[PDB]
């Protein structure tokens, strides 16, 4: 129930991309998911904007929704893929891995 990071491995095979990425085969990507509610404590890594909106909710849940649990900290991974010319290429991709979740 509470907002928490959960596991999820992506596989570039499955993703369809198997012929272009050379590595890795898939990665530990993860994802957030969970309720983010009153009284929103520590370990929900929330923003003020979030606390306010949380109470706003709690008064008129009819107005703004509760905030969503979503990453606050992401890592890059590396990949090796082929280019149009079939050169081998290494590039690191920013924000692919979820390091930690929170209220937004």
């Amino acid at each position: 129930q509470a907002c928490k990071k959960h596991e999820l491995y992506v596989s570039f095979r499955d993703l369809g991309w198997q012929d272009w990425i050379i590595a890795p085969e898939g990665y530990a990507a993860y994802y957030c998911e969970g309720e983010c509610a009153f009284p929103l404590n520590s370990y929900m890594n929330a923003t003020n904007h979030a606390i306010v909106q949380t109470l706003v909710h709690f008064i008129n849940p009819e107005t703004v929704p509760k905030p969503c649990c979503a990453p606050t900290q992401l890592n890059a991974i590396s990949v090796l893929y082929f280019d149009d010319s079939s050169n081998v290429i290494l590039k690191k991709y920013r924000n692919m891995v979820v390091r930690a979740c929170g209220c937004h």
């Binding site: 085969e25 991974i77 590396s78």
Partner: protein, 94 residues
């Protein structure tokens, strides 16, 4: 842990990097780092394409030797943990 890898870049001239040397993994206890190596195997003849550090990858966790396990790959790639682990690499299908 891994502080450095053997670095090699086939494409050093166009990329403007050196062609070899040691690359610092900038591996500092938050996220892991590994080394990797990718090379071509024209019939037992072997040419390295790239070799370097490699951001945290759950696939090369707990790996201290570079053995590639894919059948007859267009390009061979492997990673391991441990300094300069990328120094030598090997091939052994599953």
């Amino acid at each position: 842990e891994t502080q450095e890898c053997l670095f090699f870049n086939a494409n050093w001239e166009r990329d403007r990097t050196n062609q070899t040397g040691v690359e610092p993994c900038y591996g500092d206890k938050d996220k892991r780092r590994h080394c990797f190596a990718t090379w071509k195997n024209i019939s037992g003849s072997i040419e390295i394409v790239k070799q370097g550090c490699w951001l945290d990858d759950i696939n090369c966790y707990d790996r201290t030797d570079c053995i590639e396990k894919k059948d007859s790959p267009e390009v061979y790639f492997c990673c391991c943990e441990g300094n300069m682990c990328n120094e030598k690499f090997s091939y052994f299908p599953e």
